[PDB]
Curated annotation (Swiss-Prot):
Species lineage: Bacteria, Pseudomonadati, Pseudomonadota, Betaproteobacteria, Neisseriales
One example of a Gene Ontology biological process annotation: maintenance of CRISPR repeat elements
Active site: 509
Enzyme class: hydrolase
Function: CRISPR (clustered regularly interspaced short palindromic repeat) is an adaptive immune system that provides protection against mobile genetic elements (viruses, transposable elements and conjugative plasmids). CRISPR clusters contain spacers, sequences complementary to antecedent mobile elements, and target invading nucleic acids. CRISPR clusters are transcribed and processed into CRISPR RNA (crRNA).
Cofactor: Mg(2+)
Chain sites annotated for binding Mg(2+) 2: 429, 640
Gene: cas9
Chain residues that bind Mg(2+) 1: 425, 429
Name of the protein this chain belongs to: CRISPR-associated endonuclease Cas9
Family: Belongs to the CRISPR-associated protein Cas9 family. Subtype II-C subfamily.
Length: 978
RNA sequence: UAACUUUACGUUGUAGCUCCCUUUCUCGAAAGAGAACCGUUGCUACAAUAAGGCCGUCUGAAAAGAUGUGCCGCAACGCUCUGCCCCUUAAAGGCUUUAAGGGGCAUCGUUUA
């Protein structure tokens, strides 16, 4: 869009310039051609610009010069942040200094002599900003040229032409206004009238700081506590007084010195206390701005008002040009101060809260209240969930995921009525930056390889171990090494030669699972089987009371456990219920938003007042393991439903039953399941096979599935009923008729009667495969052999071989790029039918049947724009010209958009799945398998299905839930445009 | 994250000058010197820069002229409108139509000028 607008406005400016030339006489009225372009305009405007200082030009030469000035009107400043814009500005300043200092009067003459001498070319190439000019220099040049040509006797130096041309060369539309840019972000959620704050604001920075200070609590070895009011008061003003408040500086200020660690701080990482915990960017930016020119007392506080600081920050963030900011803070700041700020300050970044709202909010956070509480401090339920508010969900991935979850919810409600409760489990990856998720993938694979090394070591130590070691076994061995070979509950030495003889050393939960629901790696110790049998539902404090507990604490303190584990192991007094609830729920932003939104805006026949649960991922995995749902060996997208069952069975009653069982088991049978053969029933329902077992055949159909359920669960009466249908994964369709019209690079279309095109290929990109197809390898063999040998010497490195300039027996004119022929049997006409480009992506495929043969007519997006419903259907190898013309002898069946469900019955077999691609060189189609099972095709995609000679080729419809799978019959062929 | 103002390239097409060079002329005992079509190297200029579609103002009955810090076009979401498809019910001639109602998707709507 911005590229379109730029080219449009440039062409419009040049057109207006030509109209102004014609109106005020010069190039009187007939130098123009059929469509207003100047005929035989000279091709030496740089030279004429340089010689315009010394000579009356000519109507034509003068016109060409000014059109050249308008076309290349240089850079305007509109001040030092980026790499590339920084480099362009550096080059601009270099040329400005050179023009004002050396023996040069204007850009034209300096450009001619200096640039042709130093390089042999004027205009920039490929990215270089050496020859770039600022608009100021060119405006001075235009004024000087008008003066000089008034001296030299040019009939056209009229005041009209001067005013018009100055306006044409200098004018640009304003960048976005304050009110419009503010409207871009939503209005405040606490003060509806007001806009969302800028980040670089005293109030906003203070809110961030107060949030950080209030949420940082000190973990003392064997307790929790937040910084006392004296500590907060100590730290409160330090970000302003110092440049940055290092965590180590805060530790010195509070003098913890040892055995007291900060909570909410990764203490495993070495020198963690060197973190740059907080820096007030706006305050110090303003102070440095004033200091750097003499308006600021260097080591004493910034005297600008806090309110005034909010205003200054917002002002500098709301205007993007010297003029606008000058107006705003010309009202609001003293001229020297405003000038100093305008000379160096750069702002950005809004903060999604109202400065008015934050003014009231910040006293609560500042004194030391909690983050969430302050918001509270300060009824339309419907059957179908309303759309997800895009304002509160500021993330495209999260918004699309929530929208499809809403579609699922609404479809479920239509089919089966209002639910009693809705339980939710959202992935960790939801709501993470692409950077964050990339780092997470990196760490996950790192951990995979670390566990692979650990497994190899387990194999070396235990050669006779049955198969490959699971997770608990590797944990056993590493805990053995971490505990000095001594069981932590008794201190008796342990063998390690056994370790896997059943009932010898066990993994006990230090804090009892029944009271904490915690089975992390911080709460699991390796104890001996004999001494573990008498612990009960006791904590380590509650079991060994005393110097015995002191010996136990000495052992735990003398272990290679991380600090977190040692602290957790040795706690006596905590809020049990709080911990069991916290390990049971997920408190991320997405889950809280969904739980509040669904509860508020949807009717549920709930038991009462909460009826929305955000399951913690860990406990869902735990319940899956404990309910017999082994982590499958499957590509299936189907596993998502499996988890969905577990989260749906995770209710308060089931939780309390599990807690009762665990409490019984620790003080000395089936792990409680929701009902008998739950595992087997859910597995058959999800995978259509006795659990897992990819060797079995799948129950594709209702008959097969119900008979399988009644055979392998004859005991279970209600396992079969009127709703049990095979799972079919539903792919959101994509019937969009718009999109990229063609590929981006434009090619020469002259030699297209024979299938070919020509492209200027740089030598830096020129490879031996490309080089083998140069147009003039035959007609310039000297050049061919030279390039071949030179490039060969550098082992097919284009940039390395042709980094050295490539050129009578001496060197002749250089080469930067050579023309290379490329294959072109089809294309799209572009740039005024002066170029060809490759087809982009088919937006539709129309299917015809005639005499038990199928014909696929492809429809691309450029055809939709031009509005030409195509004639010809594909034929295997023939170029587009020799294709099957469609007429009334053919029967139209259906149109295929990507991700439409299709059925291809052929002689070999029957294929069912979502249409994905239709290769145009073969007339075959690819279809994604509905669950993307990797055992099928290549990653779940059947490639090269030939439908020309199929028996049946039909298209189906399917809804959100995967129901209502029926063939659809299209009456008339639909058009491309309306 | 959605939203800006501009610059400067690159690509193609066309013009001038230019580096090579394939064939065909003319010369000349060779070597070549100049040519013609085309290819194409480099420098400069102009046009276009999605494929496609529009408006505002001024003079005119209109046709058209003149004219402009002119506008949209690869997305997301939605169902108020419109279109295709699917379903339920009622009425009239498992087939067809109609109406109401409920959906899915978009060539429809909003952000959006």
């Amino acid at each position: 869009r911005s590229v379109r607008r730029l080219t449009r406005r440039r062409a419009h400016r040049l057109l207006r310039t030509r109209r102004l030339l014609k109106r005020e006489g010069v190039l009187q009225a007939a130098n123009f051609d059929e469509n207003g372009l100047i005929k035989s305009l000279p091709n030496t405007p740089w030279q004429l610009r340089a010689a315009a200082l010394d000579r009356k030009l000519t109507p034509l030469e003068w016109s060409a010069v000014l059109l050249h000035l308008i076309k290349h009107r240089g850079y305007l400043s509109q001040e030092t942040a980026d790499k590339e814009l920084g480099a362009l500005l550096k080059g601009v300043a270099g040329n400005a200094h050179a023009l004002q200092t050396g023996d040069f009067r204007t850009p034209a003459e300096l450009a001619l002599n200096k640039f042709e001498k130093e390089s042999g070319h004027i205009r920039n190439q490929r990215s270089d900003y050496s020859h770039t000019f600022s608009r100021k220099d060119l405006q001075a040049e235009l004024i000087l040229l008008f003066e000089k040509q008034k001296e030299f006797g040019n009939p056209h130096v009229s005041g009209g032409l001067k005013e018009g041309i100055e306006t044409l060369l200098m004018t640009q539309r304003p960048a976005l206004s304050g009110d419009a840019v503010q409207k871009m972000l939503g209005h405040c959620t606490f003060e509806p009238a007001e806009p969302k704050a800028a980040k670089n604001t005293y109030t906003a920075e203070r809110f961030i700081w107060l949030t950080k200070l209030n949420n940082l609590r000190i973990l003392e070895q064997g307790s929790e506590r937040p910084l006392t009011d004296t500590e907060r008061a100590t730290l409160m003003d330090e970000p302003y007084r110092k440049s940055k408040l290092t965590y180590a500086q805060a530790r010195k200020l509070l003098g913890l010195e040892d055995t007291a660690f900060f909570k909410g701080l990764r203490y495993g990482k070495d020198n963690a206390e060197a973190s740059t915990l907080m820096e007030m960017k706006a305050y110090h930016a303003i102070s440095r701005a004033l200091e750097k020119e003499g308006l600021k007392d260097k080591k004493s506080p910034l005297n600008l008002s806090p309110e005034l600081q909010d205003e200054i920050g917002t002002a500098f963030s709301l205007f993007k040009t010297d003029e606008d900011i000058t107006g705003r803070l010309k009202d609001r700041i003293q001229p020297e101060i405003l000038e100093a700020l305008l000379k160096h300050i750069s702002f950005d970044k809004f903060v999604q809260i109202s400065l008015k709202a934050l003014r009231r909010i910040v006293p609560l956070m500042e004194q030391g209240k909690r983050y969430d509480e302050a918001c509270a401090e300060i009824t339309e339920e419907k059957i179908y969930l309303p759309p997800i508010p895009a304002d509160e969900i500021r993330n495209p991935v999260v918004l699309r995921a929530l929208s499809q979850a809403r579609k699922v919810i609404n479809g479920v409600v239509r089919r089966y009525g209002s639910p009693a409760r809705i339980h939710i489990e959202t992935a960790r990856e939801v709501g993470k930056s692409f950077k964050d998720r990339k780092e997470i993938e990196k760490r996950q694979e790192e951990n995979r390889k670390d566990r692979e090394k650990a497994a190899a070591k387990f194999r070396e130590y235990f050669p006779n171990f049955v198969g490959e070691p699971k997770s608990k076994d590797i944990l056993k061995l590493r805990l053995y090494e971490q505990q000095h070979g001594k069981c932590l509950y008794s201190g008796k030495e342990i063998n390690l030669g056994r370790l896997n003889e059943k009932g010898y050393v066990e993994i006990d939960h230090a804090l009892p699972f029944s009271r904490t629901w915690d089975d992390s790696f911080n709460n699991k110790v390796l104890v001996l089987g004999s001494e573990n049998q008498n612990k009960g539902n006791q904590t380590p404090y509650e079991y060994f009371n005393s110097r015995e507990w002191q010996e136990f604490k000495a052992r735990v303190e003398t272990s290679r456990f991380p600090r977190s584990k040692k602290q957790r192991i040795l706690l006596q007094k905590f809020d049990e219920d709080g911990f069991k609830e916290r390990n049971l729920n997920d408190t991320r932003y997405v889950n809280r938003f969904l739980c509040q939104f669904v509860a508020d805006r949807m009717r549920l026949t709930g038991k009462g007042k909460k009826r929305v649960f955000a399951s913690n991922g860990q406990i869902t995995n735990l319940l899956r393991g404990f309910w017999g749902l082994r982590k499958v060996r499957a590509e299936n997208d189907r596993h998502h439903a499996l988890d969905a069952v577990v989260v749906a069975c995770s209710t308060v009653a089931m939780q309390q039953k599990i807690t009762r069982f665990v409490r019984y088991k620790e003080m000395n049978t089936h792990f409680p399941q929701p009902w008998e053969f739950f595992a087997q029933e859910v597995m058959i329902r999800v995978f259509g096979k006795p659990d897992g077992k990819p060797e079995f055949e799948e129950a594709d159909t209702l008959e097969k599935l119900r008979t399988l359920l009644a055979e392998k669960l004859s005991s279970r009466p209600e396992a079969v009923h009127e709703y049990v249908t095979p799972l079919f994964v539903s792919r959101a369709p994509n019937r969009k008729m718009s999109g990229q019209g063609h590929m981006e690079t434009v090619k020469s279309a002259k030699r297209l009667d024979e299938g070919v095109s020509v492209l200027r290929v740089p030598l830096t990109q020129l490879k031996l495969k490309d080089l083998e197809k140069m147009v003039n390898r035959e007609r310039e063999p000297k050049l061919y052999e030279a390039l071949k040998a030179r490039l060969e010497a550098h082992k097919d490195d284009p940039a390395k071989a042709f980094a050295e300039p490539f050129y009578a027996g001496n060197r002749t004119q250089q080469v930067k790029a050579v023309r290379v022929e490329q294959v072109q049997k089809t294309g799209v006409w572009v740039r005024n039918h002066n170029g060809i480009a490759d087809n982009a992506t088919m937006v539709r495929v129309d299917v015809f049947e005639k005499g038990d043969k199928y014909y696929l007519v492809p429809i691309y997006s450029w055809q939709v724009a031009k509005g030409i419903l195509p004639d010809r259907a594909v034929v295997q190898g023939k170029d587009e010209e020799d294709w099957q013309l469609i007429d009334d002898s053919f029967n139209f069946k259906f149109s295929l958009h990507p991700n439409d469900l299709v059925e291809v019955i052929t002689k070999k077999a029957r294929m069912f799945g979502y249409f994905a691609s239709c290769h145009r060189g073969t007339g075959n189609i690819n279809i994604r398998i509905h669950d993307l099972d990797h055992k099928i095709g290549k990653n779940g995609i059947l490639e090269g299905i030939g439908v020309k000679t199929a028996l049946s080729f039909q298209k189906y419809q399917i809804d959100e839930l995967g129901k209502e799978i029926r063939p659809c019959r299209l009456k008339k062929r639909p058009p491309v445009r309306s």
